[PDB]
Each structure stands twice: as structure tokens, then as C-alpha cells.
Enzyme design. Structure first.
Site: not given
Ligand SMILES: CCCCC[C@@H](C(=O)NCNC(=O)c1ccc(-c2ccc(C(=O)N[C@@H](CC(=O)O)C(=O)O)c(OCC)c2)o1)[C@@H](CC)N(O)C=O
Ligand SMILES: [Zn+2]
Ligand SMILES: [Zn+2]
Length: 201
Positions: A94, A103
């Protein structure tokens, strides 16, 4: 999947933070350790926020939406942590969003590296597998990183644990590359973060 937006790169690698309420001492320490892990390998630094306009807030809420990617600017932004996503490696992931990474599987070049098995995605979660549009990511000459802390596991958002949603297309060291590690920053994560933040050699 490093952001292409210069405004999302935190000035001088300096990221002020606030840890919200409703976290235990143990959880607070893990947040510190995850930040330190980023600091050890890059020129990014995390500082306790005093009067900075832009900063991250470790926000207690159920796992899922959302942790802001890069520097939002003009105010605070969430890094969201809940009971089922508070471990070190997840926080490191995170914090990857915080520093400016999407991602890995959403890289514009990802179709050369992984197959997405659409039939195995949970209905309604397919949007998580869309590529970023090419104007939104600049990979900085770095290869697609199967070992990235930002890479999905083989069965992320799958209909079942034995059904793969993501399959690497080729072998690395005579074996299919493992994906989805949440242990530590990869060599590639570090190399790419250093390029993104123009860290001294
Ligand atoms: C609908 C997208 C769902 C994305 C979830 C994902 C995730 O967070 N991915 C990375 N982030 C995004 O894709 C994304 C898109 C938009 C935003 C985002 C995030 C945070 C804020 C924010 O800080 N909001 C404030 C409230 C506010 O100021 O309005 C808050 O949460 O306190 C955000 O605000 C709008 C710009 C957007 O993140 C999460 C899953 C566990 N994950 O992988 C964590 O590692
Ligand atoms: Zn994420
Ligand atoms: Zn990468």
C-alpha cells in the site's frame, strides 16, 4: 506501473504521515517498519506530519477501497488498513501506491508478460484487471517485474482458490515466475522507485 504524472511524485521524496486512531500499538509499529523498509532501500523518507498541506493518513477501514496513488496534493490522502490487511508486506504494498505505483499487472505492456483468465474472475471484479492507459504510466525503462510487491497473486479476485486469474506467459530461471509475494520490496521495485525519485547513485 509507475505514475507518469510529475505532480504525483512527492517533492524530494518527503512523505509526511499521520497514524489515525483505532490502531493498536502493534499495528502502529508495523506501519513504522513498513515505512522504514521503503526508506532503507530508496531515497524516500517518511516524516511525522506537523503543518504540511499534503500528507498520508493511515486510515482504519475495511480492506479494499482505497489507497491514493502518488501525491494527491492540496490536502490529506488515505492509506487504508483493516483487520485482514495490516501485515507488514501488505502495508509495504500500500505504501507502493503512496509513492506512485499502480498494480504491476496493469502496465500498458502487461499482455506481453501475463495472460488474464477472464472466465475465472469473480463477476463484477473484472475492472481490476484493465490496463492503465498508456499516458498514465511511465515504466522508466524497467522490465515487467513478476516479483514486485505490487503484483497480484495468481488467483487474486478468482472465483476459487484453485482457479488462476493471472498466468505468466514464459519461464524465468527454467520455471514459471512466482507472483504475488508480500514479503519485501523486490530488486525491481527498488530499482524503479530509485529512478522515479531520481535517487543519488
Ligand atoms: C475502485 C478502486 C478500488 C481500488 C482498491 C485498491 C487500491 O487502493 N488501489 C490503489 N488505488 C486506486 O486504484 C485508487 C483509485 C482512486 C483512489 C483514491 C484513494 C484514496 C482517496 C482518498 O484519500 N480519499 C479520502 C476522502 C476524500 O478526500 O474524499 C479518504 O479516503 O479519506 C481518493 O480520493 C479521491 C481522489 C481516491 O485510489 C486496494 C484493494 C485492497 N489496494 O490494492 C490496496 O493496495
Ligand atoms: Zn494495491
Ligand atoms: Zn514495476
Amino acid at each position: 506501473a509507475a505514475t507518469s504524472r510529475p505532480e504525483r511524485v512527492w517533492p524530494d521524496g518527503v512523505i509526511p504521515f499521520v497514524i489515525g486512531g483505532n490502531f493498536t500499538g502493534s499495528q502502529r509499529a508495523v506501519f513504522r517498519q513498513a515505512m522504514r523498509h521503503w526508506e532503507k532501500h530508496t531515497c524516500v523518507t517518511f516524516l511525522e506530519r506537523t503543518d504540511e498541506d499534503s500528507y498520508i493518513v493511515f486510515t482504519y477501514r475495511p480492506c479494499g477501497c482505497c489507497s491514493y496513488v502518488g501525491r494527491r496534493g492540496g490536502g490529506p490522502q488515505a492509506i487504508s488498513i483493516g483487520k485482514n490487511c495490516d501485515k507488514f508486506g501488505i502495508v509495504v504494498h500500500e505504501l507502493g501506491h503512496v509513492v506512485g505505483f499502480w498494480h504491476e499487472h496493469t502496465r500498458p505492456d502487461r499482455d506481453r508478460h501475463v495472460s488474464i483468465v477472464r472466465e475465472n474472475i469473480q463477476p463484477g471484479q473484472e475492472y481490476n484487471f484493465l490496463k492503465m492507459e498508456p499516458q498514465e504510466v511511465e515504466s522508466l525503462g524497467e522490465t515487467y517485474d513478476f516479483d514486485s510487491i505490487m503484483h497480484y497473486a495468481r488467483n487474486t479476485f478468482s472465483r476459487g482458490i484453485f482457479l488462476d486469474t493471472i498466468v505468466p506467459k514464459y519461464e524465468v530461471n527454467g520455471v514459471k515466475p512466482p507472483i504475488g509475494q508480500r514479503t519485501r520490496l523486490s530488486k525491481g521495485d527498488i530499482a524503479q522507485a530509485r529512478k522515479l525519485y531520481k535517487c543519488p547513485a
